[PDB]
Amino acid sequence: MTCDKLPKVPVPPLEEFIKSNPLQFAYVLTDTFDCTTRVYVQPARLSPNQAATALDIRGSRIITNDFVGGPNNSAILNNCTTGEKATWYFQYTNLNTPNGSSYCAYTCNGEEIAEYKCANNNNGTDPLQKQAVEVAKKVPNGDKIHYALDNCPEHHGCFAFY
Amino acid sequence: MTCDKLPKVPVPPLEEFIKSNPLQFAYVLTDTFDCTTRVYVQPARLSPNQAATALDIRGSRIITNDFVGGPNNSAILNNCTTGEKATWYFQYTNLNTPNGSSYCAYTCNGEEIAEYKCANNNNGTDPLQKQAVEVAKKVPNGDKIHYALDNCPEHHGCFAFY
Amino acid sequence: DEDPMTCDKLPKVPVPPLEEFIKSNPLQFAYVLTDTFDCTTRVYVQPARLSPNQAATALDIRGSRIITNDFVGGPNNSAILNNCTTGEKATWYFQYTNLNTPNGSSYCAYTCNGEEIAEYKCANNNNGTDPLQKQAVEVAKKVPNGDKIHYALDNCPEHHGCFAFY
Amino acid sequence: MTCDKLPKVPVPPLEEFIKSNPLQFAYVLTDTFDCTTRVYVQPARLSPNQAATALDIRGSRIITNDFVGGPNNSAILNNCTTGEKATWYFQYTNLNTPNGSSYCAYTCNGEEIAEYKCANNNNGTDPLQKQAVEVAKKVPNGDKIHYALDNCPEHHGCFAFY
Numbered sequence: 001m002t003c004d005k006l007p008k009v010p011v012p013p014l015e016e017f018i019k020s021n022p023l024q025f026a027y028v029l030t031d032t033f034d035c036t037t038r039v040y041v042q043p044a045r046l047s048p049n050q051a052a053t054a055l056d057i058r059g060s061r062i063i064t065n066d067f068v069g070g071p072n073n074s075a076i077l078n079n080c081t082t083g084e085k086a087t088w089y090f091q092y093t094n095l096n097t098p099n100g101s102s103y104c105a106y107t108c109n110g111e112e113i114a115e116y117k118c119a120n121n122n123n124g125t126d127p128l129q130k131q132a133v134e135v136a137k138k139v140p141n142g143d144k145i146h147y148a149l150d151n152c153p154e155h156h157g158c159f160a161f162y
Numbered sequence: 163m164t165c166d167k168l169p170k171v172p173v174p175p176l177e178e179f180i181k182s183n184p185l186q187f188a189y190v191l192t193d194t195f196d197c198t199t200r201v202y203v204q205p206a207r208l209s210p211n212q213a214a215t216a217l218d219i220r221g222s223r224i225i226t227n228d229f230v231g232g233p234n235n236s237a238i239l240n241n242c243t244t245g246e247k248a249t250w251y252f253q254y255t256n257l258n259t260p261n262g263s264s265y266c267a268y269t270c271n272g273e274e275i276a277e278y279k280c281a282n283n284n285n286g287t288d289p290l291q292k293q294a295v296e297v298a299k300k301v302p303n304g305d306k307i308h309y310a311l312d313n314c315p316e317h318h319g320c321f322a323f324y
Numbered sequence: 325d326e327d328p329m330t331c332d333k334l335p336k337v338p339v340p341p342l343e344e345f346i347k348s349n350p351l352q353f354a355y356v357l358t359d360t361f362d363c364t365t366r367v368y369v370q371p372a373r374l375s376p377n378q379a380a381t382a383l384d385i386r387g388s389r390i391i392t393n394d395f396v397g398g399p400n401n402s403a404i405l406n407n408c409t410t411g412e413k414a415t416w417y418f419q420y421t422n423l424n425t426p427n428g429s430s431y432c433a434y435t436c437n438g439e440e441i442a443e444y445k446c447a448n449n450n451n452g453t454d455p456l457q458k459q460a461v462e463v464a465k466k467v468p469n470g471d472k473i474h475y476a477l478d479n480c481p482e483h484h485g486c487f488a489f490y
Numbered sequence: 491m492t493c494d495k496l497p498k499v500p501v502p503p504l505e506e507f508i509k510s511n512p513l514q515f516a517y518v519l520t521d522t523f524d525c526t527t528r529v530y531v532q533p534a535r536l537s538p539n540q541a542a543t544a545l546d547i548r549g550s551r552i553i554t555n556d557f558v559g560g561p562n563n564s565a566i567l568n569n570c571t572t573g574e575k576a577t578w579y580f581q582y583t584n585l586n587t588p589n590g591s592s593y594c595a596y597t598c599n600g601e602e603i604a605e606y607k608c609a610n611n612n613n614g615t616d617p618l619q620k621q622a623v624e625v626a627k628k629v630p631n632g633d634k635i636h637y638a639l640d641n642c643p644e645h646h647g648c649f650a651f652y
């Protein structure tokens with residue numbers, strides 16, 4: 001019912017995310033992650049810290065965050081343009097089923113949800129994603145969570161990018 | 163001597179490119195691809211044509227091209243923003259050695275080279291990349307081929323993004 | 325048809341006559357990119373009588389702090405700024421202006437770092453009620469680096485008698 | 491003789507002040523207003539009280555006072571930071587001549603001059619400014635009054651600001 005008490009499933013192995021690539025966010029909190037494609041990237045072989053990278057792609061715009069495991073099934077993100085950190089958790093994951101992948105992740109501002117990302121690669125047909133959104137929408141600030149794929153730009157021959 | 167008669171090695175399997183992720187371009191033709199990270203993406207599970215996607219990331223800007231294999235060891239690109247096509251080839255590839263990956267690819271304007279991209283994930287240490295750049299520079303328009311990683315922006319805690 | 329995708333492709337309307345800006349004084353920045361220009365009031369100033377270069381000045385006022393930039397017209401409907409404190413220059417443009425309407429003034433202005441937006445200032449004097457402003461912000465947020473653009477007027481310090489200053 | 495007996499010329503229309511923007515203070519009492527530029531601002535469109543604002547700008551610092559007309563050719567100020575009040579008068583004004591603008595204003599501690607400001611946009615060439623300063627100095631505490639543009643910071647390419 002409040003953000004700090006939401007579920008926190010274990011972060012799947014990185015390989016499970018990469019096998020899901022690319023995804024799209026079906027539901028998000030702020031406007032930032034509307035009409036967005038997610039790509040996960042393994043650490044560079046010469047990276048000293050071996051952090052993976054999450055790519056949030058909206059047309060010609062890209063938002064990049066290295067991330068690593070933290071306590072309590074957290075993912076600690078480092079914004080690659082600013083160096084600021086954010087602590088994220090997974091409400092649920094359901095990766096690489098025979099009907100594809102979905103998950104919902106979130107980051108808190110105390111008892112408020114500061115951001116929400118529900119990703120899938122199956123046109124939003126995972127029944128888990130429905131249940132999860134309904135729960136998160138009732139958390140403080142979660143009234144803002146909305147469907148993120150209405151009236152997105154037209155494509156020019158590519159399926160996942162525009 | 164001329165672009166049309168450069169080497170055309172077999173395109174490696176996609177998984178070889180993905181296992182090399184992420185790469186940087188050490189030598190390019192146009193300055194669009196300066197200070198750039200390359201990430202490859204598998205086709206979306208629901209994508210009708212099953213085209214892979216090359217991501218060309220320069221700080222906060224991303225260029226995306228779907229691609230599929232064509233005749234004569236070619237890759238056919240589809241710019242996701244404009245819908246413009248281009249036929250590309252690999253001069254050589256050397257992916258996933260015990261010293262990492264490098265390759266050089268090119269597209270032609272008849273006998274001149276229109277674009278050149280030499281990627282690696284080993285700080286430019288593959289012998290083959292030296293040989294291959296010197297050859298491509300000697301072709302019509304390869305005077306414009308330059309080292310692409312001079313004076314790039316400073317990072318904020320991420321290894322391969324800025 | 326489709327929004328501009330990089331900062332270099334944003335619209336560039338004519339810089340209104342200085343006098344239209346001065347008649348809009350003072351304005352507040354509803355949306356900005358860096359945090360520097362949160363809780364900020366804009367005042368335009370004509371060139372001084374004895375100004376050798378006849379540059380106007382934009383004042384960005386945050387409580388008891390001020391940032392100042394001389395500006396002059398440039399090619400392609402640019403304004404070229406000179407930071408009065410550092411001598412740093414920057415080429416700006418207007419995404420739109422809608423000054424001195426029956427519902428007041430708004431505009432949005434920007435400066436690019438190539439294809440990314442480096443700074444963004446949307447000002448108004450009508451409590452953010454201009455529909456043009458809202459659509460301008462949506463377009464600008466979508467270019468590289470535009471995700472940092474944010475509402476700039478939350479949790480600003482308490483005033484002590486004055487409407488536009490604090 | 492005494493501050494309470496100084497001239498009190500009419501407050502010029504606000505448009506006359508704004509047409510004079512910007513000015514510098516050639517003489518002041520307190521060193522607070524040394525090396526200082528004056529800018530006048532019209533009331534905000536939605537200001538309920540419709541007070542104008544006087545801006546005192548010294549490098550990167552600014553003092554702001556809302557002001558309205560009051561009894562006896564007075565301007566009543568409201569410090570925007572402190573909420574504090576001052577009653578000021580004009581000793582003279584000489585706005586928008588063919589040689590530019592000048593004026594001198596003052597506020598009193600009874601018979602002592604509390605603060606004094608003489609502004610101009612013509613490098614202090616207005617004969618009226620000379621005579622008005624000479625007179626102000628002979629007032630109790632008017633010994634403090636000094637040429638205020640000695641030893642001011644160097645500029646970085648702007649005429650009226652630093």
Ligand SMILES: O=Cc1ccccc1
Nearest residue numbers: 054067075088105117
């Ligand atoms: O953007 C959110 C996120 C969450 C977990 C891992 C990577 C990224």
Ligand SMILES: O=Cc1ccccc1
Nearest residue numbers: 022023024121159160
């Ligand atoms: O059509 C967009 C898209 C992107 C990623 C996954 C699935 C669909």
Ligand SMILES: O=Cc1ccccc1
Nearest residue numbers: 216229237250267279
């Ligand atoms: O950017 C060029 C390229 C070449 C081959 C495959 C994918 C992309």
Ligand SMILES: O=Cc1ccccc1
Nearest residue numbers: 185186283284285322
């Ligand atoms: O060679 C290392 C490297 C650096 C940046 C991005 C990708 C790879």
Ligand SMILES: O=Cc1ccccc1
Nearest residue numbers: 382395403416433445
């Ligand atoms: O501070 C931004 C700016 C832009 C155009 C004109 C004046 C100021």
Ligand SMILES: O=Cc1ccccc1
Nearest residue numbers: 351352449450451488
């Ligand atoms: O929108 C009105 C306003 C408020 C404070 C300062 C300037 C303008």
Ligand SMILES: O=Cc1ccccc1
Nearest residue numbers: 544557565578595607
């Ligand atoms: O600071 C002095 C003053 C006097 C009259 C009007 C505005 C300001």
Ligand SMILES: O=Cc1ccccc1
Nearest residue numbers: 372512513514649650
């Ligand atoms: O350079 C100082 C200055 C400031 C305002 C008006 C005239 C001159």
Ligand SMILES: [Cl-]
Nearest residue numbers: 054105117119
């Ligand atoms: Cl996520």
Ligand SMILES: [Cl-]
Nearest residue numbers: 216267279281
């Ligand atoms: Cl390539």
Ligand SMILES: [Cl-]
Nearest residue numbers: 382433445447
């Ligand atoms: Cl501006």
Ligand SMILES: [Cl-]
Nearest residue numbers: 595596607609
């Ligand atoms: Cl004054």
